[model samples]
Target chain A: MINQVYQLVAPRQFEVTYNNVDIYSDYVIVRPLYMSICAADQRYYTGKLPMSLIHEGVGEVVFDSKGVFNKGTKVVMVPNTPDGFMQDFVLLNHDRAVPLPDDIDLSIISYTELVTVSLHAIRRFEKKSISNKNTFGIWGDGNLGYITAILLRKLYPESKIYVFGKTDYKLSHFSFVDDVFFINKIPEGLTFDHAFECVGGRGSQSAINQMIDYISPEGSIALLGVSEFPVEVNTRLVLEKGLTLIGSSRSGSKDFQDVVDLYIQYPDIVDKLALLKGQEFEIATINDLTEAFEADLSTSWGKTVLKWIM
Target chain B: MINQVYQLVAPRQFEVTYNNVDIYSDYVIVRPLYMSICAADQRYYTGKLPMSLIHEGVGEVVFDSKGVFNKGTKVVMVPNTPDGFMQDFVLLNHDRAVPLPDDIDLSIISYTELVTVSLHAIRRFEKKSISNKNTFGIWGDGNLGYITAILLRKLYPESKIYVFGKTDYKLSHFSFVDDVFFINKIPEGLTFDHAFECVGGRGSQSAINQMIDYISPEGSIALLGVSEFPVEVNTRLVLEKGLTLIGSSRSGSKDFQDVVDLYIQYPDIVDKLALLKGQEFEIATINDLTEAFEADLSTSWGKTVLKWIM
Candidate 1:
């Protein structure tokens, strides 16, 4: 038997009890040693997320006879599995699952799921060759934005970077990071070659358009957030400016594992990033999710991990 | 002395009057026998057009003491002269002019200015070897859209063309040219590899975004519109799909003579297009711009050509 969190409908929440781990076929039965609250989850709670929420959770494989994995191996299976978070053990296909480095701390593993998406986004612009000479505008200061900026700095050390967000606290946290600006005050005269919008909504869309207009011709904007609604756009300006607008979802649809691979490449920063210290709660405590749901969503002060019943 | 058209402020009617041509040491005056209104001009009216209006018109030399052109020789001067238009004749430097074909009729010559833009747009992708098998989606069915579609047929004999717009008459006029769709009813499963936004502004931007979502990976959306406002865009989508967005204002930007060179290549189409068979307004019967502006904009009875004392 397992205790799981579920949303019955809008503004309604419930905990379901289930027996037998054969819920999802491809997903192996595993206890979630740790799970982090993603921006998508916060948006889902606020009724702002566009993509349906089904995929969330990171766990260690308790049983694996599927030949794709070894038994008892730790892995970061990004929330690609539909209806994944509702159950303690999820059944997901192996292709979407990536094996993690065994020696690293397991708590920080869930955050690695986001790296996949960032890698895929960066890979798309591999042709542009981002480096010190080129610059990028990151248009959110949330966890996703922070992770994206961190990854970009790793990918292109010499590039000038700027982050736009509404909060000074968020900006202060990233003081050591590339130049951070108040959302309302995007600097003038800096023509970026790339832009990333971590916030997904009409306002985000508007900010993306401004960035697109501000970007030099042949530049690109990577959209990582799911817009709450289909926002209005000016196609003529896009055509006139000659820009590349990208819709990037998930951490790395094609290259998430490469992020795991990159873990081997740079363990120092990855180690600093992997320090996933979070407030923990047992499955019976419904308040953990409820409290986290109401918390300020701009940053995840720390990972909100749901420790499953063993 | 030269006659020119001038609009002191936006929405003001164009005033045509004679002004003595100020001769620059290196510049010569040209008699603008014919010119055309491009989509770029409409952007200014809507307050969306970006490039300066001084770049739109084409003219023929009237007084060239430098054998650059004998007084009667046919030529098209880059209309970047100060106080461009609102006049009968304009002056430009030698480097800014392209010799036009004497055999060409001014009636159809008006279309050439926009046609040059269209040709420039198409030529940018010519190297991609577009063919009849390729599908095209034209966002606006205005004059620019019409010419581009016609030119695409000239370049890619087998390409399938889809037109999306709100104006029924404009859509109806394209009955012979393509498979038409109401602005709201784009085909259910339809997607295009080559999408063009002939209209400028939000409509064009939305069309481009939709195309980016629908087009196959590696497809392109070519833009040729004048937008006065910032168009909304999703850069993330562009990066994921790996699509290229190109902005083609005017080929003359780089080589002032490329369009003329193209005209020379397709000399046969010159007379048929030059006829300008339908666009004319008798000042004697028509009221001034204020009286005519609302009516001209309310419905497209015919191409608008305002004439006044010069």
Candidate 2:
């Protein structure tokens, strides 16, 4: 197979390259319809991680050597792939492709992978020893934070959702959330049954510190963010209160299945998720891909999606 | 009923006091036969805690208002009392006392409460999501650490028990343990499926750090240790590995029942535990109690038992 793909050759540098590859027997070939830039993908683009480009997207089944899927069927790609998602064509294991519902907007369905990451964490949180179930707090007002809050609210309808972030403009996007507080302005008495640390990197320690300080004893803290450096935690509080800290990454087929069920069961939640979608860039050339990534970097708020088919 | 009790009126100061009270309907009057000085009890004695003295002991049922026990029945007191345990006679709820086997030495049953503390942590550890059960680590060599090692070896016979401590004399007491390593001499390649933080006080953070470094991803750390101050934890590693840190304090009826069954099942363990019994103090006067507390403080190793009735 001859395909055009974007390769990250150097820091902040992406070049279009043509490659001939052999497709595996059980693998299905996919052409990305819409690719979304994850913070991890941006890490690669900006030089934090020396790896390939975009990892999350919606694609069309071009060929199925496994004889499992019809041609042109839209599928949500589970992005834990070695190769980048911005390729003119990509191949994934048969199990990794989750078929999308035709009724939903394809652009919206492209956001499924991100939602699945959140779903995976929430699923793991259900297995935690959280003493209180009345309220859950989320740190970060970015796309991941917004999606997690929305999903948590839908899954636990009675549970209060408290969002903590630095930006008022970004935090204001959460209308469905029970309460929103500026991170620095969090009240001393306010606490939660469970909390999600969506704020990664240098901020993770402080976010965790706040979670430890505020979460009820025996409550659970699900870590959905990615941090490269070690973050200081209050072991005293953890030991004293019997708190459980759960870490979650990417998503699997089961998570995708759960996410699809969530979308089907709660269309209202799917509609509300549109609030996290920011600028949609049309990828006509290599510059378009670079521009999309640059826009994602420049903005401190929502997610940037690339219309790859264009 | 009028009884003499020791009260902590100030820091590191114990005064004998007289108290007259009526026992509740569901409460039983217990006369302390053998009171064990827990580290928490020592904390009160050493002024770390301002509360009253003693939280673990074996008692004789002087009077059972609920008609649940014989007058001379020997019982292991579950000593997480609302008041305190250092008294001529103490009132405990009916459910708090577990009847001891008549054949075993009454003094040995005093160790039951300490053993139950380890048992409680192990029970919580069973509730955790540990990926491997083949090996686990304990980071103390004190009485709590020794008891935890013994209980873990008995409960999970197939699992490898690794003991880390500063004292060779104390660590050598574990005959059934799979491995023992000095805290500073731990091998670089050594790792664990789960860990018990038995190293309390100032050394807790370093012990926890070692556990974090050596424990396998998704492993559980049971905090059997107590700390007076906040200890820093590696939250980044915790999140990355999806580790669970469980805090366990006093045990309940189920734990006591389990310990009694363990004692009955393995008399050999009881014999091995005899090695942990240090100086047995005869609590004939207030001076005797003070002397016992002082002896416990001066000792670098082993537990001090108060032979109350003598």
Candidate 3:
């Protein structure tokens, strides 16, 4: 079958390349149903070369030669492939396609990859964190921060999750957390056992140092944000207070599987995450993809979903 | 007992004060035998006022009202007290003092406090570090680095220890390690499972970032350094590489006990540590103590030991 693959030939330019794939080959054919535009994807779209785009999306199963996933079964496609999910049909190894629940909304699970990324950090943090699991500080009122706070609340019901952000409007979105504090106006002695740094770029320096200052002894500082520049850190306090800074990266099959299981265990997670979806784009042409990217840039809050009608 | 306590009355000045203590009190009377000057102590000498000097040294058990420690038994006096160890007769709580073996040299254990600090970091690092402990990278050529490398060598026999430093002469002292490299002249593709940041001050920024670049994925970076200012960190690579930054602080009673047990387990630890002892000054007068501190400032390598003959 001829596949119309979306390729970013240059910065802010999207082009199509047709490719043929064997449907009968040892792979699962996932036709993407919905996709969430990640800040990471925006960075790549505004900047990749002669390379395929779309790394995080949920899809529908078109064909499975091994007969594991039945026809019409919804799945979250893993992006560990060179070919982007922006294509008509992404041929993935069965391991790369995590089957979603029948009753769950596919559009909400479109950003399962981001959830897995946060889950991966939390899992790693849990293993390395101190015994004190009561209080948490999440730095960033962005999508990653929202999803992290959601997951932590579910995992540790007894814990108090405090979200910190520079913007009051952005922080107000985090109603599920125990409390939300403006970065500058935090109480003098407000402290937490662990923290997650979801704020990257120039803001990362401040977010990281603030966490270092307020974090309790031996707490784990989970780092997931991507920064272009070096973040200035107070090593003196880090040593004196006995803190742990855990740097996390891309997720794997296990992380996706765990997230899928979690979505089933607590379906409200999908409801909470859906609030973050903003302006779902119905993609049928290269122009439509360009329009979505353009619209997303104008919008400052939440993830922009892509309804893959293409 | 009329204790002639040497107190730092002001910056760059030491004064003697007398205090009487009851011999029948519920505490251990440990008269300091040999004391070692630390870099931390030098900082206090140049800064603090009306405070006691010296927190690390070895002493003798002069009298123990509890009878847990025999009189005349060699002991390393703990300097947890507000009164400095630069006194003729220093009284300490029994738990503060750790008795040394009869066969061990009295002067060698004078710097046991420093050894415990390094040991504390290594123990914590070992716990948080990944299973890939075959290769280790230790940054710094100072006394702490030397002690850390020494502990790592003895603890992990199968491991290859590599020390990184700016000074060639200071690094040459680390002959027991598998290899040593000048920080700037490190060979390409040389990586380690874990690294210890023992270099503090301005150099800490360079040492930490270099470690982040060379450490393997999921490797732990044990931080024992104390930098006055914030260190600029390459957090981008840190998150991408999946690293762990473990910050450590003061060693407790258990750490001291463990070091004592380790000394018994590995006697050569004493021999290797003796190489770090630079100048041995016999302190019979306040002038003698002043002379040692002045001399230590000029010397760049090893520790300064003051024989407590005063």
Candidate 4:
């Protein structure tokens, strides 16, 4: 049997490669149903990369020779090295696929990888933080920041959540937040017990500095941002106030499982996540993948998910 | 009665101003006996302006209006704001002084503040670091690094301790360390479970990068260094490996109290600390103070202690 692999050969290009499948093998085969385009994926798609793209996607199990998974079982495919979830058929170890309830909307569930990453950063922040848990400042009104804010809201209902961004419309998306402010227009005397830097790239430097300046002493600053170059940090103030900067990326199997459990326990979380769904594309050709990325670049906020039908 | 205050007027200058003493006041008067110079004091001495100096010292109690302390009690004097411990007679509130064990050498105890600072950083590190207590790396062979290394050896005797430095002779002072290597010549395949950046100023940037590069994933980096300018940090790798950067500064009142308790419980700690003392100055005049600061600038190895007999 032929397994089609959609490989990213270079910037702004994709090539399909043939992988002869072992239909009666120990490994399970997943036909990806819903795929999410991450900010990281967009960067690799437009600027640089030689590896396969997309680390977030949900799919259905097509073949498992040992009957480890039911035929047409709904599953969320976990990342395996460079084995991109963009493929029409993703080959995975039996344990690499997490089964999800068929009742939830599959489109929002595709962003499970992104959700787990948010949870991973949160766990780190909780361990390093002090008891000053009244105020939380989340930088960036982008997808990651919004998702983190949602989790924080459910986790710490007594705490006030504030969102900061450079754009007006993006900041408006955070309707559930206690407050929203433009980065440069933050009010005097406003401070946070702890802060999260979900703003990456060039905005990462400013976002980090703002957290250091405004966070209470001994509070944790969780850095979920991914910057290409080095960031300039004010260690003097950091030393004076005794702040902790926690850098976290991606997620582990434990964190992934926890997210799935949390979503089932709180079905409203799944409903809340749907708000971040920006646009959906039915990928029928190579040109379809191009449009999703092209359109994502222009999108002010939310995630561009592709329904893999190629 | 005239109380002479040796005030630092400008860079490389000291002037005396008289403060009239309240002879029967409740505040305790301490005749400073031994003083230890800090690396922070060196910067204010050469380039900075308008602050009283020497944060670490030992003294004899001269007067306590409330009889809170014995008249001839030898105690380790605590820092009070810019209250220069360099005064011919330093005045402190009753609770500011902590009594040292009568038999231990008082000169070594002059560095209780410095010792307390090291302990403070370690406590912060313990709270944030992983259970990776096997190998510990301390950057900077300066006074802070040596002191921190000493504490690490005593606390985690099971862990291997490594010290990194720029100068040859300076690193040689860390004889008790498990291994020593020059910063540039760090051997291949050498990695640390966790690291402490005791190197401050210009060298701080490199020390941080080295720690990030060599530490295992998810390990913590405790920053004790004080830098005037912002340091350029490799946040990319930091996120990839999920590294945590913790910044801590001067010790608190509770930390100061803990140091005195620790010193009394483990008297050998005081002796180990004595090895870090470089030169002792008997300050009989203003020029004598001048000589100590000048000599300390050249003495690359250990702390410069001043015997205040002025």
Candidate 5:
């Protein structure tokens, strides 16, 4: 069993016990090392996000049949597995697990999962054969948006990428990688081939619509934000513009694998995209565990990790 | 040049005087025989649909560049040709004009564009192998929903369809083609493979959410409704379900060609689908077109055509 913080609903927090499972030929017991909280998770915690549960932290394999994994083997489990973030040590079939790399830091695996989620959206847009040399615009300069920008520059080397938000400091990280601009800096007739939506709710919808508004016809807008409110847009404009509005969710296991591969391949530049500030919180009991979540969420700067001692 | 109704923010409906074509092309000039009222048209008329002004209407080829067969070649012109619609005569590019079949009556050609719109959505869903075997559900029982059911059965002979709305004469036409059921008629845990969103505002958003609720995972939904109001949906639920949501605008001449072709092949069936009651109202002279529109909408329970003669 493990101590964890599970979201019951908006503003309502609870301490829950999760399971660590062992895999037989037919079954497996998986232990989750650590899970990361995303912007969507923060929105859900604040009662700002519109949907029910979302992608949670990572899980690992504690017991593998046929001696495939050692008892203490650490791996990151994909959150979208049929069972999600709430459980402690739940039983998972072998099909659910992905082995984490031996050299990678398991502690920062949570942030890597986030990159995978953002990467998955990029991959989905790439399936449409978008230009690698086109101008890429990102609406939100938050963490998700930041990661998406980083991954986008990596994915489309020739694409001139721009980040739109309120402040320049938030966009500082973006300047290091690609062309980042403020929302107001955009001039009329300024258009792009693709836009990725990271902000959620009606505001994001409006921003996304505006982004699409400036895009040339047959352009695409990849919406990755989970919104709490619905937005109304001029349907006729979309038709006239011929925009492809694609909604993408969190990362799958393959996305994680790709991110891990990127890390191994480019050890120097991988973490630069992700501003990982690891917050170590003390968890003596299950109740204490959830309190750490509350405290970590109170601040907006970085991801919080609770090191538990049973 | 031909006569057409044109309006911008306000209903200053003017005669669209067709002038000399600046280019050499064999485009058919159509006299809009009938104008169908759609949710989209309603939004545009009320200035609620944000964007430049436009409309959709069907017409007869009163003038042809080639003088092919001495005029009176029946055709359907999607008046939303990017060119203004409030004209006494509108010159369309040859590619934008689709010829109506000889067997199909010209009276119903005005509605060919609207029905073709439905045909576009259904065909996209069907052709992409997105919808499962055509067990379909429509949210609204109004014009679009009613026509969609008719087109689905006409397109796919071996398909089961249903409309989730109140049981009424609105669905009387569907009874001839599909299974019209109240919302409760949906069996528990039985999901539809396809859904058509004919509603677009908040109400439609809830309806779309409910429709998505019934769609089996990996199923597809085609949204044809236009709402000036933004809509909110459970994105997490949509992702968890892995639903494919596709939006449809009025298709160009090619989509209409297929519908026209189908009508030519199946005259009797297509003839019954469009019930056009052409009524020419001097809507331009009316000071309060909103109130006039309200009155006209109130009586729209049975009528299909509302031609605004400027």
Candidate 6:
């Protein structure tokens, strides 16, 4: 099979590449319908990072060698692949693709993989005894932060959810959050039972320090952030307060099922997630792909989507 | 009854204070026999900290209202109390005392309370799945570090144990440890499956950072250190590697039982602990109590024990 992929040639430079792929008996070949821009993808596009882009996407099963899915079945691709994922077609082991409901919008379903990352972290939080009565705090107003806050609100409805970020406009979008504060505007004596750090890169240190300062003793801090450099943490307080720090990254198929189950249980959450959608671009030419990535880079407002309808 | 105790009136200052006490139905009146000086005790003695003195001691049950312990039973007292423990006579709930084996020396048994702190940390470490096949690391060769290293060696005999410390002489005391290195002298590519941070105060950050550098992915770190200041940690690595940092402090009655069980199971380990015993002070007057604390402050070689006979 001939597959088209957007490959990073250098920092801030991308080019279209073609590769021959073998579809094994257990592999399901997918034709991507719509893909979402993740911070990781943006890092690659801006030349800050090097890799094939687009780990978050939904596609139709174009070829199923083992007949697991019918020719037209829509599924969400699990990201975190050995070979990077930005392609017109992706070959996944049958187990990696999660089947979506026909009633769900393909655009909204494209978010399944990223939503699973947040859901997986919540699952990690659920493993802790403290998560039951948690007063949750989320640091970062970007897409992951927005998604995490929404998932936490859904999974732990009784818990107080507070969102902390730099941008007032971006934080204003979270209607489900009990409180939203400018990172600098967090009031005195406000403490959380648990916190998620979604702020990454250079800002990670400051966000982590704030978490240490605000989280109550013996509370858990789930880290969903990605930083190229080592972020400094407050170990003294961690030991003194008997805190637990849990680091979460990509998700597995189990996490996907959990997200699916969550959506099934609360169908209204899909509508809550829809509030985060921003401008969409059609990837017809190389210029269109570049422009879509540029749009993703320029805004902290909402997630940018790419229509992979070549 | 009127009991006399050494109290920290101010930093680096102590005076004898008398307090009246009534024995309750559940209480056992104990006369402290041999009390060991812990780094925490030394912290109070030097006026580096302000608190009532002595939390680790072996005492004789002079009167038992509960009848759980026979009169003159040799027992180790649980350290953390509302009123503090530096006294000639102390009242304990019958459950708070662990009766010692007749063969055990009271001088050696006085070390039980502090030893249980290390044992409790290991118990916390045992709760993690990673501890099953762990290569242990201990940071700090002070009393807690020394005790933690010795405990890890005995409890996890199949696993390799490494000790990191500032003083070569202190690290040399661990005959059972697989390897010992001065913190600055640690060679390249040394990795650990689990580590205990016993380095407290200003040295805590460096020790924790080194653990982050050396610990394997998904490893566990049990912190038994005491720090008055916030110690910085490498949180980026902590998240990336999915590490767990556990803070353990004073032990409870159950932990004391576990420690006693360990002693009963391996009586030869008592010989190993005996190696850490150093100078002993006879406390007959206020001057003797002050001098014992002064000797503790003057050396980091070994623990100083105060004979409470008056």
Candidate 5 lDDT, B1-310, residue by residue in tens? 2233344444423222234542235766666554555444555565432222325565667677656533776666655444544455667766667776565555456566667778877765537573336577788777677778777766666777778775576656566555566665666866678888776555666677788677877576777776555565566555556565666675777777887787777775555655534343444443534444555556644344545454
The candidates score, on chain A by TM-score, as follows 0.81, 0.92, 0.95, 0.93, 0.81, 0.91
Residue ranges of candidate 2 with Cα displaced over 4 Å: A23-26, A47-50, A126-135, A158-160, A181-192, B9-13, B21-27, B47-51, B64-68, B126-134, B182-192
Question: By lDDT, is 3 or 4 better?
Answer: 3
TM-score of each: 0.80, 0.87, 0.94, 0.95, 0.76, 0.86
> For residue B151, what is the lDDT in candidate 5?
75
Q: In candidate 3, residue B173 scores what lDDT?
A: 95
Flag the better candidate by DockQ, 2 or 4.
Answer: 4
Docking outcome class, model 2: acceptable
Model 3: pairs clashing at backbone N, Cα or C within 3 Å? none
The model with the greatest DockQ is 4
Note the residue pairs that clash in candidate 6.
Answer: A11-A47, A12-A47, B12-B47
DockQ of each: 0.33, 0.44, 0.85, 0.86, 0.21, 0.47
* Share of native C-alpha contacts between chains A and B (below 8 angstroms) recovered by candidate 2: 0.53
Indicate the docking level reached by candidate 3.
high
Evaluation by DockQ, superior candidate among 5 and 6: 6
Write one digit per residue (lDDT tens) for candidate 2, span B2-100. Answer: 877778776557677787857655789988888778776766566533345777778889888789998989888886622677787888788888888
Docking class of 1: acceptable
| Superposition error at A191 for model 5 (Å) | 2.2
Which of the CAPRI classes, incorrect, acceptable, medium or high, describes model 5? incorrect
